[PDB]
Symmetry: D2
Amino acid sequence: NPALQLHDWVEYYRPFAANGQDSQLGICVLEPDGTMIHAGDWNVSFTMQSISKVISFIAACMSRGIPYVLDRVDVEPTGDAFNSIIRLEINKPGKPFNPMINAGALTIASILPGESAYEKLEFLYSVMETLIGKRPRIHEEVFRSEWETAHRNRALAYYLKETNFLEAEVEETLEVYLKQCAMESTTEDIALIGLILAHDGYHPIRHEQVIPKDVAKLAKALMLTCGMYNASGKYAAFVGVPAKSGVSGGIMALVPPSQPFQSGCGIGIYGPAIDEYGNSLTGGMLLKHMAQEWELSIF
Amino acid sequence: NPALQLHDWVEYYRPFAANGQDSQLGICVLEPDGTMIHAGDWNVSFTMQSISKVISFIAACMSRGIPYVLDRVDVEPTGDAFNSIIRLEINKPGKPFNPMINAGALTIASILPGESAYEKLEFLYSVMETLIGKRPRIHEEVFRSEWETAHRNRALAYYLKETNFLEAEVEETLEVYLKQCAMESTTEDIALIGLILAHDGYHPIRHEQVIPKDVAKLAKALMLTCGMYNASGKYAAFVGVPAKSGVSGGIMALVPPSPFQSGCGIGIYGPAIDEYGNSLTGGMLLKHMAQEWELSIF
Amino acid sequence: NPALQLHDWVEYYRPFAANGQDSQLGICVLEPDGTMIHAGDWNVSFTMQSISKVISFIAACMSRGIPYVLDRVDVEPTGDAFNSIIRLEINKPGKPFNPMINAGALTIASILPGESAYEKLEFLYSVMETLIGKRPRIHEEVFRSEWETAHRNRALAYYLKETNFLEAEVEETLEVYLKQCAMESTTEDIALIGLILAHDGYHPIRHEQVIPKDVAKLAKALMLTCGMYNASGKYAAFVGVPAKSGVSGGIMALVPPSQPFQSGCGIGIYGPAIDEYGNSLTGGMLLKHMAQEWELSIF
Amino acid sequence: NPALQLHDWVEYYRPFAANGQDSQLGICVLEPDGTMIHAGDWNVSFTMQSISKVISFIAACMSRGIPYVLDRVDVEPTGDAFNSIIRLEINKPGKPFNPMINAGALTIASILPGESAYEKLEFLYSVMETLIGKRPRIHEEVFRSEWETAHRNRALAYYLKETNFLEAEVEETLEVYLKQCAMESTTEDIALIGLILAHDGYHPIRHEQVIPKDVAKLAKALMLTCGMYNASGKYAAFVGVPAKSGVSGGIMALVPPSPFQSGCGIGIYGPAIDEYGNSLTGGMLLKHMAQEWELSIF
């Protein structure tokens, strides 16, 4: 059923990509026992974009410890856009609200262990490797294009610098931030990432505690609350499963233990066309429909 | 153990009420089988205040239907104070972000079924009655006091009226709104309301579907995302249990099925509240439970 | 010339009333020597609306003294709409920015001498009488309509109450505020009002110091800076003369002493159709054109 | 008397520099006939900082023309801090409100004529030269220091670039911007610049039209409405003279024709500045003059 059903909903939702800003749609669901299913363009490589924020938040937590990270960044939804800047001036002293939005993610990248973008990125990549099992390939072309026009982000970054919420130089931090966003991946890779988090940091395939439980838990908490930005409320209400998105069109979702996926799973969706919030338009229609039918809500 | 650990914990966190604006602290946990445990001021009656926004919301949905409510109110966190008015003007057209914040709940009040505040209130008291099993008692004194000085809320109400997000007269809506907030309850009552919700609307004591499953589910979603206002994030991250509070000191919380392996309802009372409007001691108490028994749904 | 010229520009600008939200346009310029000119619909009665704010600000200043008024209300432009409310919550303790916007004007009305709307309004009317020479007639119909739908204003009012910036009950204050806005008048009446202010509180016709110099000066200062709300910057730049507007379409302008109007004057314009800022669309095109040609700018 | 009253006043307000973040205070008033009076630290050189936004603005207008500048920047007060970024995001599309605030002046810098910061700077130094009568000297040390830590301003610049309100590269614009701010001057120089402006651009010492009348008029309008940022209101109400300040302590002001019956230029220096970025002592000094001699154009 699952397999058959995904093939149906993918083909049923593919068309709404004319309402976003493209007609590609892929999904991959993975279980702790290795069972894997997919439909659509699930093996097509795309940059993780904002999905990498979950990982860097993890890395920073593992290196510095949750306390150290919480001093620098909060965990509250902002109600604003992922790249909004107003709360950095308004809300004094100006601490970023959470690590999912651009501002907090920029802060996180700045507190990653290392003295240079390379040193920090090395630590991030190594962790990434403990998850997907290989080193992250990067999309130089995308990183280049992005490094040349990351205006909004440099503004955010520079503003954070001033209010002293950047444990590193601006351009240095941009590089870290822009590279992680350029880390290539497929629905298969992010699906496996969710499956690991779904099981509180335990890799069910490799039987090894790759991420500390409390950290993986904290990560999930933030996905639910800020993972989909100022659309998270909707996701919680109509999907009710931790999820994170990437402007490139990806969505990493996951279901914690306890008919279908009774043992939980990691979800990986790809849908280039994105909505006003920056979340995959059809990717979201596919995730909502799934959760709806199989009743995945953790509420 | 739970019964005992609760007594220890309450006695332990009671003294922290000195940091908020109060020395009381009470709890009550209820299970589907009927087992109930409590410690401290669990029987001291208190107004539900905002804890009622969840029932009025649930009621609007039962009457109007979810589709109708979602056209009048959204379900997004504002990242602002519960009584913040900012977004009613800045975010045009001006649809209130969610029913948990004062702006949304007022909108919700205006859409309840009825030609008057009385009619809208009776429908509310009835739903609230198929939950706690009795007509709710209203703290007349508290209401009269709030009625005279609910300025902030009146501004909110009036602004919503201006942006056409009130399907009722302002004063009529204030009435309905300030009335539910005044409804009286003890940890036992909200604990029950929380158990019913935890079980997707099935009342585990009368064995009956008292709330449309999808509606109860939606309420729980809102609780987790906005129930504790601009403090909800920390709550999902440090307690991880859907919760809802009232400035009177109440906290309603619940654990979905799978200690308390079959879910549960939580009722907490702690008059002293923090900067976000959530009970200080009550909040600490819920956190300890959450940590120690691992209730987090994450 | 002046007379002839006004008749021309009125007829040239009348048509642009199809771009506002009506085709009426009137003007009346008055000098200290009694010389008066007008064109268009200058003798048509309209409610002063926000123009009354200048008067109540005056009254309050005369009764309480500028210090007392300045404690309750500031004199800074807000950059927001005349009926905006955000700064009442954002900017703590939440003091209104100026007496020209709705919020500050509501505060002013609340500090007018009296215990009731009647007692306060009596004081305001009496002052109004010392200016126009008669008691203000009121447009009951407009006041009624307005009292039934002044939502935005009650919100403002009620919010001020909470932050304690209203020296009176909300509804009481609304009545005061809503009545002054309903005070009827013609271009002739407001023109004479400007002429008095133009001469620092001296009635040039009646030869009597009706308004204290420092108060009339303060009033002018605020017209220039906040009189046209978030359009005052434009007026200062393209008109450069103190001015106040009323949503009903009126504009009261004035030129202080030192070819045309060398001895100064008071200007009264009426143009029902108003722009996005709430300022008469054609009334403004007429005031700009005048200032431009005769070079009225005080800069 | 003026020469003397100035000495008394300066000596009198000097001591108030303890309340701001400095003990210096200097002034210089210049008339069309060439009479010049001064008291205190009037010859102590200081960077113009924001006082230069008026000349760069005047220059952009001379080169591009007013119509072109007004499509890139408005002339409205923001009611916010000079270095506030808020409106660049909230007020869409995001056109900076006015050239006096940091956001606008940066926009202005980007539109000056030129293919590089050097070319845009030379055009600026030339205009500034047909005013003070000499190539402006740049405080290299101060500039180098600001260049390394102008974060806030960099954020502003970068946001404008994002909303397409910069007709130049960010760093190139920062350069031009941080360079003019570093231009050196004494009360005498800004006083002169103020006299020229007071006379609608006619230089009363060389008898020549050095600034298009309409342009000089527009500059004076902006000075009165935004020159003192979110403190301009108080200034129109308590000084009533078009003024412009710099965080270095400078204040430029001027009185249009009809003491000083033929207008005048004012140059003030007072390092200690208030919460709005305007000189504390300098501000008090200008106010006293304004009151005592009745300079108010209102």
